């Protein structure tokens, strides 16, 4: 568009480049995502247009606001509210000392509120990761890109050939389950929670089988006892090695007993057993939750 001065490139997202831009008629500063398609084919599938446009109504204080969905030329632009930092960069910048535990708790509590809202409206994210959790100077954290995965799919590589990360992917997806449920987002958020606390990714796989086997090495190879139906999933192999489950006290120290209990429920293998966002908000871990302001150096 010529509707925007394009103040900088913010980064490269799953589907295309993301810019910080100023709207000239409002003076508003926004984030613009350029999403394309191989022009020749389907194009923008008109079906992605309708369901993405529906996301303009999915508003909550912990969901990054989708301001507009512009279909023009053969390009789809999503105009979003702008936030000043993403959690991946904030975690990297906090490597030395760690994000303080009360800020970690606040962020998790706010993220669960955004999931509970979206889930109650039957919208899933499916590709939660630190890069798409955005924060501001006032202590808020918001989820970006809810609903897009349903619309475009999740590719192996991005538009610029970068590898899409598998680290936060739920085991039912890796085992080939066709139908995602809201439990996939709870798994991803559990993995992000553990990474905030320990300052290392919980399961940093570099292929689908490395990702699955990292999960099995820590939580034990799932069986029919812990996950009824697992041996029948499309990508399950009877030849998977049989690892014993480790103890949580070893996986996320120094998390206290409430935190470890909650994380265990967010990482249950059976998606039917995995805690819901609503139920997680009532867990005793959040009894003393507060809303601290982070040190942001913009």
Ligand X SMILES: CCc1cnn2c(NCc3ccc[n+](O)c3)cc(N3CCCC[C@H]3CCO)nc12
CB of 162 to ligand X, least distance (A): 10
Residues that bind ligand X (CB under 6 A): 10-11, 13, 18, 20, 31, 64, 80, 82-86, 89, 131-132, 134, 144-145
- Angle formed at CA 218 by CA 171 and CA 106, multiple of 5 degrees: 75
Looking at the Cβ atoms of 107 and 216, the one nearer to ligand X is 107
Q: Which residues contact 111 (CB under 8 A, 6 or more apart)?
A: 62, 133, 141, 143, 189, 192
Alpha-carbon separation of residue 221 from 35, 126, 206, 213, 224 (angstroms): 39, 23, 19, 8, 10
13 a known binding residue? yes
33 labelled binding-site residue: yes
Catalytically annotated residue among 127, 210, 223, 270: 127
Q: Does the annotation flag 11 for ligand binding? A: yes
Asked if residue 83 belongs to a known ligand binding site, the reply is yes
CB of 65 to ligand X, least distance (A): 9
For residue 120, give both structure tokens.
């109650």
Which stretch of DSSP H or E encloses residue 19? strand 17-23
What is the number of alpha carbons within 13 Å of residue 238 lying toward its C-beta?
0
Which C-beta is closer to ligand X: that of 83 or that of 111? Answer: 83
31 vs 191, which CB is nearer to ligand X? 31
Task: Provide the minimum distance between the beta carbon of 288 and ligand X in the complex, in angstroms, as a whole number.
Answer: 29
Query: Residue 18 annotated as binding?
Result: yes
Name which of 3 and 265 has its Cβ closer to ligand X.
Answer: 3
For residue 16, say whether it is annotated as part of any ligand binding site: yes
| 38 in catalytic set | no
**Residue closest to ligand X when measured from CB atoms:** 11
Count CB-CB contacts under 10 A for residue 253.
Answer: 11
Q: How far is the CB of 286 from ligand X (least distance, A)?
A: 26
CA angle 226, 269, 90 (to 5 degrees): 150
| Identity of the residue, 50 or 89, whose beta carbon is nearer to ligand X in the bound complex | 89
253 phi and psi, to 5 degrees?
A: -70, 145
Cβ 27 vs Cβ 18: under 8 Å: no
Min separation Cβ 197 and ligand X, Å:
22
Give the chain's length.
298
Question: Which residues contribute to the annotated binding site for Mg(2+)?
Answer: 132, 145
Question: Which residues contribute to the annotated binding site?
Answer: 10-18, 33, 81-83, 86, 129-132, 145
Would you name the residues annotated as active-site residues?
A: 127
Question: Which residues contribute to the annotated binding site for ATP?
Answer: 10-18, 33, 81-83, 86, 129-132, 145
């Amino acid at each position: 568009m010529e509707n925007f001065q394009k103040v900088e490139k913010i980064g490269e997202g799953t589907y295309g480049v993301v810019y910080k831009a100023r709207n000239k008629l409002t003076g508003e500063v926004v984030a613009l995502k350029k999403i394309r398609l191989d022009t020749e084919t389907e194009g923008v599938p008109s079906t992605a247009i309708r369901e993405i446009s529906l996301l303009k109504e999915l508003n909550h204080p912990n969901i990054v606001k989708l301001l507009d969905v512009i279909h023009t030329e053969n390009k789809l632009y999503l105009v979003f509210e702008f936030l000043h930092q993403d959690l991946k960069k904030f975690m990297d910048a906090s490597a030395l000392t760690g994000i303080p535990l009360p800020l970690i708790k606040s962020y998790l509590f706010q993220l669960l509120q955004g999931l509970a809202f979206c889930h109650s409206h039957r919208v899933l994210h499916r590709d939660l990761k630190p890069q798409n959790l955005l924060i501001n100077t006032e202590g808020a954290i918001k989820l970006a890109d809810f609903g897009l995965a349903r619309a475009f799919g999740v590719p192996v590589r991005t538009y610029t050939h970068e590898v899409v990360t598998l680290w936060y992917r739920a085991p039912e997806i890796l085992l080939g389950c066709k139908y995602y449920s809201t439990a996939v987002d709870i798994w991803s958020l559990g993995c992000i929670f553990a990474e905030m606390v320990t300052r290392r990714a919980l399961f940093p796989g570099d292929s689908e089988i490395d990702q699955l086997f990292r999960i099995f090495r820590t939580l034990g190879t799932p069986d029919e006892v812990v996950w009824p139906g697992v041996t029948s999933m499309p990508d399950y192999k009877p030849s998977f090695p049989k690892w014993a489950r480790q103890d949580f006290s070893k996986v996320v120290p120094p998390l206290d007993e409430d935190g470890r209990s909650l994380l265990s429920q967010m990482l249950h293998y059976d998606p039917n057993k995995r805690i819901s966002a609503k139920a997680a908000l009532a867990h005793p871990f959040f009894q003393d939750v507060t809303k601290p302001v982070p040190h942001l150096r913009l």
